[PDB]
Every structure is written in structure tokens, then in C-alpha cells.
Amino acid sequence: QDALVLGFDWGKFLKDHSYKAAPVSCFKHVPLYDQWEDVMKGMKVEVLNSDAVLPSRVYWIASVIQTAGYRVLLRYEGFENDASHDFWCNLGTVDVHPIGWCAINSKILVPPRTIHAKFTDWKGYLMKRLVGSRTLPVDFHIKMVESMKYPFRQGMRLEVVDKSQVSRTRMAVVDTVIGGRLRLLYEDGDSDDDFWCHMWSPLIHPVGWSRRVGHGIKMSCDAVPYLFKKVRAVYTEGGWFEEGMKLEAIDPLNLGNICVATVCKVLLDGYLMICVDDWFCYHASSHAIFPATFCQKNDIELTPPKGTFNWENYLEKTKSKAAPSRLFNMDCPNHGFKVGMKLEAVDLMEPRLICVATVKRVVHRLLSIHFDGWDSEYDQWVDCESPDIYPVGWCELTGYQLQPPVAAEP
Amino acid sequence: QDALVLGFDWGKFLKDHSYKAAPVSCFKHVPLYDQWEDVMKGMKVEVLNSDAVLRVYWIASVIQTAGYRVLLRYEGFENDASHDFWCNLGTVDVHPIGWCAINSKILVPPRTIHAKFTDWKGYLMKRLVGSRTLPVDFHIKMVESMKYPFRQGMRLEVVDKSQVSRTRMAVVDTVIGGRLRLLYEDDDFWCHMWSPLIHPVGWSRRVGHRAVYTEGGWFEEGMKLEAIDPLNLGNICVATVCKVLLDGYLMICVDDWFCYHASSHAIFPATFCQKNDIELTPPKGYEAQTFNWENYLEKTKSKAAPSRLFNMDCPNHGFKVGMKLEAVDLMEPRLICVATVKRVVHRLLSIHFDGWDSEYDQWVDCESPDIYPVGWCELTGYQLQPPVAAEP
């Protein structure tokens, strides 16, 4: 009872408290993403009968009551309105199947002991309930394992942004790969000098990239450039960004702050060095940069420089121009994030941690993420397509540890 | 009074059907676009007083807007809507408050309400506190704006309408609101001066028939994608890259060759249609209903152009399903017709021609220079096609 401390349980959390989880279809980088909301209220599955007596184990049919990311709340067939034995099932587990699997696999359907005496004719009860029903896709689990083969492997070398000096890259080696997240070890430190990120992270690049584009590098098998997420083509009418133009940018050393910034250098391939006004590289397609006045116009606190800030007044004092709004991609796809929705988020200041979190703001494309239990100084601005946010059940699906929603060490 | 057949009236049509017009702010290419933030409900103008005999003026306020047309109520009618009247804002006889005084004209009350008050000036001066009017130079700025840079006798290249893999020498016959009528040198052709179908002299030879910042691979021959069929704009078809020309242009065909720039809003990645619930027209043979890109790529032993190369980014462009506008019939581009926004799919609009079958519908980009606000024809002097299956 007390002795089995397995860590944060979303089921307990979301049973006490009526929360909505952001659905799987919100997150493009994640497994099951395409095969998704094939799942929803009322779908039937064959699942382990857990109130059985005898493994060689037995199965029973259950139906989706509610969804919470990858997790579904199931009710065994025959409980009807009795919610008292509803249980969560993560859809990436091996013991959930389509209707039909037992028969193919020479297994047996046995009612739960709880309700077994409700009917004699269980088989015809089930036939009536199953008419016109839907079930899991065939190959569901197969297709999932297949999408969870990743091209980054232990021992591939690459260039990563230097966490101690964000103006240069440094050499790092892949140590661990789990669900598309990477643990990188830095070639000139270690053993506890690492860096976690997603494999689509804007912070990593194939060896030789920094040199080709003009990014500073600490020091001069190699992950092949094909392995990396390539950036959106940017089309412009008229000129491009230029050294000196002013804008607003998420501070990469404080993701809670969007700041007054400057273009410091135009690199090749649409990459820019920007500084808060220590240089940091964003691609021009980056959702972490915005034109002057974006904060004021959207009800975000703009972090001014050292030290009442007004854009026109600033541009006059500094003898400067704002980057034209035409250069930015500000759009808003109908992403489906809503204020209040729960999810699992990387703590970007300490990215080995993935934590229970909440959407606190949706500002077109930008979410403000709050880590439940923690002060607002820990909140983070991220793009709605960030590879660093995950649905409910992702940590469970990939076997990663999820931090509970309390202010303590892990 | 019934001998006076002036053709299609937007006033009666919007009123009778309770229709709404897409605002001028949806259309970047049009006169008055830059000045449009100044036009809003409650704005005050000096306009001719029509309800008078012996040319005199009166103040009116904006009750409703429809593209360039405002519905006006003469000051002093108050809640009486019986004399509201439409006014196109590109016309000469609508003015900023103070125009009369400057031009030694007189403000005279409409004879319907004239006996409401003795002190009209006191009444007006009260109504006028804290109100807005037109910009001082509103018509000057427009007339300066409609002084077009392509002029008559000017020469360039157009896509061949009977044969789209080829351009064809043409000359500027007429200029009307940015639109050019061209006559081939080598039967006419209309387009906007921002047409992607027109190029400067030499351009055909410069490419082999914007800027672009990218990393890694570009578009490659044999890559598959979806594209609006130039020969049937109501269809978006399975298409193939045929040839990569220079400065970002691409020769495509339906699974003959047609040119699109890589930034074009008329090409999309494979599966765009099914993701967005648009009916994809599949290659002659397939049906869909059932067509499957997964299986088509497998079978044709082909790759899809990657998604990151397409210029897909979508503004709050402000078009909404149901909104009325004036659309060029792009299969017969001399015709500009009453039309409706029938679909908004990110950047892409399906335009429906009121009175015609769904087969005349056309897919166009939200920033297409070939769609115009209600009242644009009236403002430019062009003829509007009415909303009826009939000919001009």
C-alpha cells in the first residue's frame, strides 16, 4: 500500500479534480499522432480482466468513458451506469487490443467477478452492445512500435548550442535515446555534463553546420545532416533582416521573459544572431521572435532593457528601425490548445525534467506553460508546435519519469 | 422611372437578402486600402442633399458599411431609417466636414425633416462633438493612387490561355483600376497588374519557360504535390514537378506543363486536401472517395515534395464564409461578377458566383489580386456582372 511508491498518477489526479487534458492531436511530434482519435468516447476494446483468479490470464471487453491524452478511462462491459470500477488504460500498452484479438489468439473472455452474476447469456449481451460499435485499428500497436524507431543512436556526434555560452555551439555525443528525446554528452566535460532535448530541437545541428553558416563554435561517427529536422523555407517580398533591426524575442536564458532585442548578425540559410539589449541563434522562421509591439498589443509583459518603456521613444533614442512585420511568421493555425488544459512539459531550464503542467495563456501560436505547484517565475513561453510539450500519458507511454506537481527536488 | 435600367444594384441586393460584404481591409491591392482604418460606423460626411430643388449639401452619418459603399443617414432623421441611402466612398460628392465652408457651399436641411428644429446649426454642432470624418485629402490620395505605373503602349509577356506551357508577347490596351487589358502581338486578355501570369519582356528567356531563404534540399523533378488546376480552377489535383527553372519557378503538370513560383499559394503539399477536408481530384483512373497518397506514392514509386518548402502561412485575413464580394471569372477574365466566399481553408478561398452552378466555383488565394470589395466596379467604372446564369 504505502510501500509501493510508483510516482505521479494522472488517474488519481484527474479523478479528484475534473480537468481537461490537451488531446493527442495537438502535438505533431508524438507517437500515435496519425492513428489518433480513431480513439474516443464509446470505442470498445479487449483488455485484461484484472479481477480474475488464474494467470494464464483472461480478458473482457471495455468501453471508453473519457480520454485524457493517451490515457483512456474504461468501463468493463456489463457495469452499465455503475462507474465504481472504471480504470485508466494507456493506449500504448500491450494488453489493450481490438475486438477479435482473443479469438485469433486463442484467449478467453471472462466476465469480472464483480458483475459476473448479472446475466447468464453474456455472449448475447455482448453481441447487442457491440452492434454498430468501433474498435482499435488493426496493427495499432505494431504501427506505434514502428514509429518509435528513431534515427539517432548512441555514439552519434553532432553540434549543440553551448548551455554555458549560448553564442557558440560545441561538440556532443548521443548517449541515450528515449521516445525521440536525446541525452547528449559534451565532448570536453562529463560525466554529469549533459544536455537533454528533443531530436527535432532547434539547438542541435550536424557536424560542420556552425562553420558553413558563420555561427561561433567552441572547438572544431557523425550524425548525417539528413537525420535533423530541416527548417521551413522563408519567402520574402523586398529585403531581409539586417544587422541593427529591433524586435522582440523569448529570452533563451529566461523563457518566462519576452524582451526588447536586436539583430546582431545575419548568417546563411535564414539564421540570425539576436541579442537581448550574449548573442543567441534563432532561425527567421522561429516562433520565438516577434516584431516590435507584439507584447503591448497581445497583453504580454514586455521585459525592457536596463531599465517606462515606449517603442517609438526607444527607436528614436537608439537611432534605430524595427524589423518590418512582414518578415515574421505570426499566423495562428487552429491548434486546439485551450487555457486550463493539462499536459506534460519539459522544464526548459532543466530539460532532463518533464513535469505536470497547464496551459496558462494561448496568444495566437504561443502558449504560456505553468508547472503546477511552482511559482509563476517558472512559467515558460513556448510555440504551440514545440517538440518539448507532450500529452498526458506520454511519460508513461515512453517509460520516462514524470515530475509531480509539487515544489520539491526529484 | 422603370425605363431606367441601370443594372445590378448592391444596395437592394444586400438589403433584401440580409447579406454582409467582406470589408475593404481584406483586400491589399485595392484603392483606399491604406486609408480604410478611417472608415467606420458613425463617421460624419458632407454629401449632396438630394431632397432639394433650386446644388446644396447636408451632413450624414455612417449606419452601415459594405466594401466601399456606406449606407448614410442625413443628420436629424435620428431613428427614422426611411431615407437612408448608399454612397460609394470613391465618388466626388462626398466630403470631410468643413468642405462646404472652404468651397463656399451651403448646408441645407432635407425638406422631409426641415421643420424639426429652428436652430439647425446648434443641433449639428452638438451632434458633431467628438465625431470623426473623412481624411482631408481622402479623394486626392485615391486619385494619386489610381494613376497607374503600367500605362498604354507598355509591353511584356503573358501565359498563353489556349496553351499554358508557353508565354506570349502582349501589349497594354486599357488600364482600369489596376487591371490591364492586353492584346497579343503574335481575342484579348484581362488581368490585374499584380498578375502572376504576366512578366517583363525577356523573363521567358531568363528562366527557361520575391526572394528565398532555405536550408538543405530544394524542389526536385518527379516530386509529387497538389496544385490548383489553371485549366479548371475549381479543382485541386495530384501534380508532379516537371522541371525546376531559375529564381524559384517550377514547371508542374496534372497526373499541359504550367508554371508556378515556389512561393505560390496555388501549390500545396501531398495530403493538404484530405487534412483540410477539400475534395482532391485524383489522376484519370482513380476516384477518391478512395484515393490514398500512401498507396499512390508506393505504386508510382514516387516521393512528395517536402512540406517545409511550401509558403503556407495563414494571416487573420478576415474572410468568412458567406461574405459577398466582386470576383473576376478567371476563365473569362473580362467578366467581374457578384460572388460569395463559399469556403475558407487557411489561406484558400472557394469563390461561388451567385446564380451559377457549383461547377463555376474557383479556388483563389485570400490575397489574390482578382477579387475586389463590393462597390469596386462602381468606383472604377467597370461593369459588374449580375448574379444570374445569363450572358453579358
Side-chain angles (χ1 to χ4, degrees), chain A residues 1 3-11 13-14 16-19 21-27 29-34 36-37 39-50 52-138 140-148 150-152 154-156 158-162 164-191 193-210 212-229 231 233-236 238-264 266-277 279-296 298-305 307-311 313-315 318-320 322-333 335-337 339-374 376 378-408 410, chain B residues 2-14 16-19 21-27 29-36 38-40 42-53 55-115 117-125 127-131 133-143 145-146 148-149 151-155 157-160 162-182 184-185 187-200 202-204 207-255 257-273 275-283 285-293 295-297 299-302 304-315 317-358 360-392:
Chain A
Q1 27 263 309
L4 307 188
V5 275
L6 270 85
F8 172 77
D9 170 32
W10 276 107
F13 198 71
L14 297 164
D16 301 351
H17 286 159
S18 17
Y19 300 125
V24 174
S25 58
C26 285
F27 303 86
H29 50 294
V30 303
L32 291 175
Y33 175 65
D34 288 278
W36 208 261
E37 265 269 333
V39 170
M40 90 158 325
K41 214 221 179 169
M43 162 191 259
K44 312 297 197 194
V45 299
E46 285 184 4
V47 276
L48 225 59
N49 186 356
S50 72
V53 291
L54 260 180
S56 35
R57 53 181 47 121
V58 303
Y59 290 84
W60 190 238
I61 304 327
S63 99
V64 187
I65 290 321
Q66 132 190 21
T67 310
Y70 291 119
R71 336 235 299 149
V72 292
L73 189 63
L74 301 174
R75 177 168 314 159
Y76 281 128
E77 279 305 302
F79 273 89
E80 317 207 289
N81 301 291
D82 182 5
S84 66
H85 280 68
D86 281 6
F87 63 96
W88 287 93
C89 163
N90 186 302
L91 292 185
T93 58
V94 330
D95 62 327
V96 202
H97 301 291
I99 309 308
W101 185 89
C102 280
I104 284 176
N105 282 265
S106 293
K107 311 288 197 225
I108 284 306
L109 294 171
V110 172
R113 255 181 92 188
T114 322
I115 54 159
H116 86 264
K118 274 199 175 166
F119 308 104
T120 301
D121 193 9
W122 279 111
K123 198 196 154 98
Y125 183 75
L126 296 161
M127 273 312 300
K128 276 164 185 148
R129 297 272 315 214
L130 284 170
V131 298
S133 64
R134 72 197 148 116
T135 189
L136 276 176
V138 254
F140 190 79
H141 194 63
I142 279 186
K143 284 156 121 100
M144 200 201 88
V145 331
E146 261 71 58
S147 75
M148 283 185 78
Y150 306 104
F152 283 103
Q154 194 174 85
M156 294 170 174
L158 75 228
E159 291 169 11
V160 65
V161 72
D162 186 349
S164 76
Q165 198 176 126
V166 297
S167 41
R168 66 187 179 187
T169 51
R170 79 199 250 214
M171 286 327 265
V173 163
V174 182
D175 172 42
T176 293
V177 174
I178 163 147
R181 298 199 54 77
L182 303 173
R183 196 186 174 215
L184 299 176
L185 286 182
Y186 285 126
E187 273 186 20
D188 40 31
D190 292 306
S191 239
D193 204 20
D194 65 5
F195 191 61
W196 289 87
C197 63
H198 194 263
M199 68 184 27
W200 296 1
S201 177
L203 301 179
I204 52 168
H205 311 271
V207 305
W209 175 88
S210 302
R212 195 187 80 231
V213 309
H215 197 292
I217 180 142
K218 177 169 202 175
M219 207 178 323
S220 323
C221 65
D222 286 0
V224 130
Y226 162 78
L227 262 44
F228 294 77
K229 180 74 171 167
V231 286
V234 179
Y235 305 89
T236 157
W240 185 231
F241 289 93
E242 299 164 2
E243 303 176 20
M245 289 189 158
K246 310 272 188 204
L247 40 359
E248 303 179 359
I250 302 165
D251 184 355
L253 309 178
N254 203 321
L255 304 145
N257 294 162
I258 288 176
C259 317
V260 173
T262 306
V263 190
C264 296
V266 175
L267 313 171
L268 296 190
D269 296 2
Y271 292 95
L272 295 163
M273 295 306 297
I274 273 77
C275 78
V276 156
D277 46 50
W279 292 8
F280 43 82
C281 187
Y282 278 122
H283 198 260
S285 71
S286 165
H287 282 108
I289 59 173
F290 323 89
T293 81
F294 176 86
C295 287
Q296 75 182 49
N298 284 295
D299 276 61
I300 296 165
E301 172 175 34
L302 165 73
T303 306
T308 189
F309 182 94
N310 166 281
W311 261 117
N313 281 342
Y314 189 63
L315 294 165
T318 61
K319 288 187 190 202
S320 272
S325 310
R326 64 186 171 78
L327 304 165
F328 298 81
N329 176 214
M330 280 335 268
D331 73 36
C332 15
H335 49 59
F337 281 102
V339 159
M341 283 180 160
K342 303 285 174 195
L343 55 68
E344 299 174 3
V346 174
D347 172 359
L348 284 163
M349 296 296 180
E350 190 156 341
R352 71 186 196 282
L353 303 176
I354 296 170
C355 310
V356 170
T358 311
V359 183
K360 166 157 150 289
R361 308 277 309 269
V362 178
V363 180
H364 307 209
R365 288 203 64 92
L366 219 46
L367 325 168
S368 179
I369 300 308
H370 169 82
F371 299 100
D372 289 46
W374 293 92
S376 285
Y378 298 83
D379 299 354
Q380 272 157 24
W381 289 110
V382 307
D383 152 53
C384 68
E385 277 167 358
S386 156
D388 291 321
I389 59 174
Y390 300 99
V392 177
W394 178 91
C395 277
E396 171 181 46
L397 194 132
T398 57
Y400 204 86
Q401 277 186 75
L402 178 51
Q403 304 300 307
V406 220
Chain B
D2 279 328
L4 296 177
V5 292
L6 276 82
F8 181 74
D9 170 41
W10 280 109
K12 172 205 231 263
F13 180 76
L14 300 176
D16 285 12
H17 298 98
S18 279
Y19 282 151
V24 170
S25 47
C26 288
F27 314 80
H29 52 293
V30 295
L32 300 179
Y33 174 82
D34 287 336
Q35 299 205 85
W36 208 253
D38 312 308
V39 183
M40 46 16 106
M43 178 183 232
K44 272 56 184 164
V45 302
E46 300 176 342
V47 275
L48 269 177
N49 166 23
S50 61
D51 179 356
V53 190
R55 235 194 189 95
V56 295
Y57 292 84
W58 191 245
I59 314 305
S61 63
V62 174
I63 306 298
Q64 187 194 326
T65 309
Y68 291 128
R69 329 236 305 143
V70 289
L71 178 61
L72 292 186
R73 175 169 309 156
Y74 279 133
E75 282 302 309
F77 269 92
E78 313 198 314
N79 282 304
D80 177 4
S82 52
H83 285 70
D84 296 355
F85 63 103
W86 287 96
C87 169
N88 187 298
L89 290 176
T91 54
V92 309
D93 52 349
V94 51
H95 311 277
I97 303 305
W99 182 93
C100 277
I102 292 175
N103 290 274
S104 355
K105 294 312 183 208
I106 301 294
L107 293 177
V108 172
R111 102 177 218 75
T112 315
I113 46 175
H114 85 273
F117 304 111
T118 298
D119 180 16
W120 276 110
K121 187 186 177 79
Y123 177 74
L124 305 166
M125 231 153 65
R127 294 287 138 160
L128 270 154
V129 175
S131 67
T133 193
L134 298 179
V136 185
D137 41 10
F138 188 84
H139 197 76
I140 282 149
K141 301 195 155 221
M142 186 189 84
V143 311
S145 110
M146 290 172 68
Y148 295 100
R151 317 151 307 157
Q152 215 261 44
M154 285 217 156
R155 342 99 330 106
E157 302 166 341
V158 246
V159 307
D160 197 341
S162 117
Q163 219 278 297
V164 301
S165 46
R166 68 180 198 184
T167 63
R168 210 200 156 165
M169 220 58 213
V171 312
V172 180
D173 188 351
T174 34
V175 198
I176 178 134
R179 290 192 60 81
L180 296 176
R181 185 186 161 201
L182 327 140
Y184 316 98
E185 312 176 20
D187 174 11
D188 60 66
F189 194 68
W190 288 89
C191 66
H192 203 266
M193 39 178 64
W194 297 13
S195 200
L197 302 182
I198 64 173
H199 305 284
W203 175 99
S204 266
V207 301
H209 180 119
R210 237 84 207 18
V212 199
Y213 292 79
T214 347
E215 187 165 44
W218 190 235
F219 285 92
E220 282 162 29
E221 301 188 351
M223 262 172 186
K224 296 217 184 292
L225 56 107
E226 303 174 359
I228 297 172
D229 177 4
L231 289 190
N232 202 323
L233 300 146
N235 296 166
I236 301 181
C237 313
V238 176
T240 301
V241 190
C242 286
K243 182 77 191 158
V244 176
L245 323 153
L246 334 155
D247 239 288
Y249 297 85
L250 302 165
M251 290 304 294
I252 288 88
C253 74
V254 180
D255 292 23
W257 284 11
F258 36 98
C259 187
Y260 282 127
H261 197 252
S263 70
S264 169
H265 289 110
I267 54 185
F268 320 90
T271 80
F272 176 80
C273 285
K275 287 155 167 60
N276 283 284
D277 220 81
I278 290 173
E279 175 149 69
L280 177 77
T281 53
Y286 311 74
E287 191 37 273
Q289 3 275 172
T290 30
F291 183 89
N292 180 294
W293 261 109
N295 303 343
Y296 182 80
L297 293 177
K299 200 203 211 223
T300 49
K301 291 255 293 218
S302 290
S307 306
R308 73 175 162 93
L309 307 169
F310 293 82
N311 184 31
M312 300 255 278
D313 301 8
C314 187
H317 56 43
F319 293 97
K320 265 75 160 231
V321 154
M323 271 184 175
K324 309 288 165 199
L325 54 65
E326 308 184 357
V328 172
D329 172 355
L330 273 173
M331 306 292 191
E332 204 175 315
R334 102 185 141 96
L335 306 183
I336 293 181
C337 323
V338 161
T340 300
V341 179
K342 169 197 191 137
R343 293 276 313 279
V344 184
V345 184
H346 308 327
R347 273 245 155 204
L348 199 49
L349 311 183
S350 181
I351 312 300
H352 178 72
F353 289 94
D354 298 43
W356 301 86
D357 200 305
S358 268
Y360 298 76
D361 298 345
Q362 95 205 341
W363 290 112
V364 302
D365 189 57
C366 67
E367 296 177 335
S368 178
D370 291 317
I371 62 186
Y372 304 98
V374 157
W376 182 93
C377 286
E378 180 180 47
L379 183 146
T380 68
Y382 202 97
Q383 291 170 48
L384 183 49
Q385 306 302 307
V388 203
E391 228 190 12

